[PDB]
């Protein structure tokens, strides 16, 4: 519906890169929210606010004046603390409920085989939570799988390899009402 | 590292000097919700369906860059102008979907270890440049505060064509070239 953003605090009074990022960590939806901001100067985080600490802390010596100044101003420290509710809790319970937490893309399964063996390709799905299984008649652990591949366009793909030479690749995904089974030919 | 079910990066401000280069993005579970075009002052959603459901005032992101541009000038005058060295990026080309000859597909070039976030990524079809039908994402942040970026190329998988992903960066004495053909594995 409407997204809320984290506002970084300001400093008082040859190529360089400055980074700021505000992170919201969710566990049981909104029952456990952790809120962290990071101030980076040339690949060196120097000031970080962490909701587990409750105040700004100097990561390196360069950030001691900035952390002390921001924590000494009550109106500044209280604005940063309240961002766990005005940003993290608001975005999860609000716009993300209509967008990210609702996006579901059904996976595509192909069962082509080749060895130097019998790999199952599960492509284009969302979210990344997925379970792939091998079962000719009963599932065999044996077998290695690739890491979760992030396509970058809100889709994922994964490749599971069956080390062993009527087979079925079993896939369970939150987007599927029933698990997908494909009749492998070898 | 922090363990959680979801990570919402509601605000990523990156600014570079000289050149007056900025970028503001929103992330959820590692994927880009949108970026604020700092020149047009408009919000650009990666998924067009998300823009139809949610919204975001881009002026908030613009004033987010105004803060980091201010803090960077103060930090430059504090660290006695200490710049960060350039890094050599690494590229990886792989297809989005299982390759089927004649069926349209998308080629992905994953360039990682990008710092500073300034790069020149281009595609080549049979040693000839192709500029039409190419999409490029923003700079995603890494945990070591370096960056990575993905480029896309829609193509028709033929048995003859040879594709290259050319990467030009300040940390490269020679451009990096990653190859891909229709009969490869990765």
């Amino acid at each position, epitope marked *: 519906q409407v997204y*809320s953003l984290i506002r970084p*605090n300001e400093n008082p009074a040859r190529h360089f890169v400055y980074q700021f990022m505000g992170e919201c960590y969710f566990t049981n939806g909104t029952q456990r929210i952790r809120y962290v901001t990071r101030y980076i100067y040339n690949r060196e985080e120097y000031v970080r606010y962490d909701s587990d600490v409750g105040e700004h802390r100097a990561v390196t010596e360069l950030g001691r004046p900035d952390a002390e100044y921001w924590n000494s101003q009550p*109106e*500044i420290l209280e604005r940063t603390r309240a*961002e766990l509710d*005005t940003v993290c809790r608001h975005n999860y319970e609000g716009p993300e409920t209509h967008t990210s937490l609702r996006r579901l893309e059904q996976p595509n399964v192909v069962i082509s085989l080749s060895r130097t063996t019998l790999v199952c390709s599960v492509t284009d799905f969302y979210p990344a939570k997925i379970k792939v299984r091998w079962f000719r008649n009963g599932q065999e652990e044996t077998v290695s799988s690739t890491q979760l591949i992030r396509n970058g366009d809100w889709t994922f793909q994964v490749l599971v390899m069956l080390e062993m030479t009527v087979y079925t690749c079993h896939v369970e995904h939150p987007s599927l009402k029933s698990p997908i089974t494909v009749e492998w030919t070898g | 590292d922090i363990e959680a079910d979801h990570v919402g990066t509601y605000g990523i401000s990156v600014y570079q000097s000289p050149g007056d280069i900025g970028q503001y993005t929103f992330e959820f579970d590692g994927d880009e919700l949108f970026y604020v075009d700092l020149d047009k002052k408009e919000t650009v959603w990666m998924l067009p369906e998300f823009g139809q459901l949610a919204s975001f005032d881009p002026q*908030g992101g613009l004033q987010n860059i*105004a803060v980091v541009k*201010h803090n960077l000038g103060v930090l430059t005058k504090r660290s006695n102008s200490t710049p960060a060295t350039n890094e050599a990026p690494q590229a990886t080309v792989f297809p989005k979907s299982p390759v089927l000859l004649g069926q349209p597909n998308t080629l992905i070039c994953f360039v990682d270890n990008i710092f500073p976030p300034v790069i020149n990524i281009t595609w080549l079809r049979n040693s000839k440049s192709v500029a039409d039908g190419v999409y490029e994402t923003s700079f995603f942040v890494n945990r070591d505060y370096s960056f990575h970026k993905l480029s896309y190329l829609t193509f028709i998988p033929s048995d003859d064509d040879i594709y290259d992903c050319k990467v030009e960066h300040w940390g490269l004495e020679e451009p990096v070239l990653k190859h891909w053909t229709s009969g490869l594995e990765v």
Partner: T-cell receptor
Amino acid sequence: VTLLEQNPRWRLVPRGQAVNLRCILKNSQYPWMSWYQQDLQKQLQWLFTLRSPGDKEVKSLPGADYLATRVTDTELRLQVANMSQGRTLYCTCSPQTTEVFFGKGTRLTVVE
Amino acid sequence: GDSVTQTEGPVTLSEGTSLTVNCSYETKQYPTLFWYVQYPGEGPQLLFKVPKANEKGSSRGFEATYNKEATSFHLQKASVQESDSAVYYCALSLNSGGSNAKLTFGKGTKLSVKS
């Protein structure tokens, strides 16, 4: 005391003429400078908010065309052209934690 | 945060009575509520602010409650005075949305206190 300084206080503006206004910031802890408009019916409305030097924003509402500029760290300008209805323009300053402080204001009177 | 509805003035009270200026806000993001007073020959100046919801801010004899339940910010004073004859504005600002230093004002309520 006064954290801002806005000049002039009054202005007689012929119809269709342009007006240039100034505002000087006197406190560094209030860097977010803004322009607010109060019409003849005493209705306050936010116009711009400029922070970094070189910012340039345009707003065109009925009665006056605006053009605000943040020249330096403490200089805030505003040009009001094609004016056909009188109004008052207040220069304001505030920190990021919203605490807006209004100046004395500049009353613009349009005469035909 | 679109609108802020305020009590339609003018309010005429006798010195010693109690003031009650209603205000109801309508927003989509967490706001910070304000009360501004403008005297007949001055500019609008901040009376008090309430950043935290379900709390109350006080200035002179004026009080207002950040009632998040009913989305209200009613201004109340026990004993009004002639010197308080001015126009009062209900205002808010989004804590995590849009531009900074951006207040949304109501239409304003005029107060006239006769001795």
